[PDB]
Amino acid sequence: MPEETQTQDQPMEEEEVETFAFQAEIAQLMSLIINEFYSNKEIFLRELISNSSDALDKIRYESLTDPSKLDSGKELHINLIPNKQDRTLTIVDTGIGMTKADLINNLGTIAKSGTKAFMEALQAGADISMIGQFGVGFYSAYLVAEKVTVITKHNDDEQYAWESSAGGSFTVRTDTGEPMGRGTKVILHLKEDQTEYLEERRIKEIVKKHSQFIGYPITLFVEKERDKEVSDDEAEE
Structure with missing residues (x-):
């Protein structure tokens, strides 16, 4: 039963990409949550x-x-x-x-x-x-996220890289990264008001109590960006 598998990929790009704007009704939901003055809900x-x-x-x-x-x-x-x-x-x-x-x-x-x-x-x-x-x-992940970037590839299916957060629009385009077989990479950027909410020990203790209900394998791992150097520089582009 081959549900997917439909050719390699068509070399037709630059379709003006996909740009979606928060609709009026969505502006309501988005406003009702952010107009809360941010009470911080780590729940x-x-x-x-x-x-x-x-x-x-x-x-x-x-x-x-x-x-x-x-x-x-x-x-x-x-x-x-x-x-x-x-x-x-x-x-x-x-x-x-x-x-x-x-x-x-x-x-x-x-x-x-x-x-x-x-x-x-x-x-x-x-x-x-x-x-x-x-x-x-x-x-509603924008509650505690300045930027929400999701990159994902599915096995046999094509690659997808789309942007999300709040404030303007939503974007989706064909991806050509090719980093894994089939995984969802959920990477969100912390705001400067969350610089202290990055304590490993905090995460360790918080997930320790909440994961007592979830009976599934979880791993707190950290790879030290080595060999290369990732920092704030101004030279690219």
């Missing part, structure tokens, strides 16, 4: 780690079809890699975070109606605390 760690757990449960489901073990040979897990020099936090997923059809469909961002009829239920019923559990608000 999102548990919300997001739940979805990534689903992504591993998804590949785990695919392992029922796989007669080798799980994916290929060794293993599959959630890896957290903080880069203090770049001020970036890179989470690499080796499962199935998202699919290409859902990617273009604007995962849980496609309101069309009027934001959501749940806005009314928000007046007397639910709160913003269920932001991610509704499966229609994973873009």
Whole structure:
């Protein structure tokens, strides 16, 4: 059953790229969260780690079809890699975070109606605390992220590199990086107001208590940017 596999790739680029602007109804959701004056809600760690757990449960489901073990040979897990020099936090997923059809469909961002009829239920019923559990608000990551960059490649399928955050537009274009077989690279840039929220010990202790509920392999690893040098310089371009 070959669902994918449709030619190597067409050498037709420069299609004016894909640029999407936050729609009026989306401007409401985006405003309602940022106009909170930023109360800091690190609870999102548990919300997001739940979805990534689903992504591993998804590949785990695919392992029922796989007669080798799980994916290929060794293993599959959630890896957290903080880069203090770049001020970036890179989470690499080796499962199935998202699919290409859902990617273009604007995962849980496609309101069309009027934001959501749940806005009314928000007046007397639910709160913003269920932001991610509704499966229609994973873009709320901008709450604590200045820049949200996602690069992903799927096995046999093409490569995708798209930008996200808040403030203007959303962009998606064909990728040609070719860094892995099939992984989701979630790297978001910390704001200068979060320079102290980069303590490894903080992360260690926080995930220690929350991961007690999640029964899946997680790894806090850090690769020291060596050999080369990554810093702020002005010479490129």
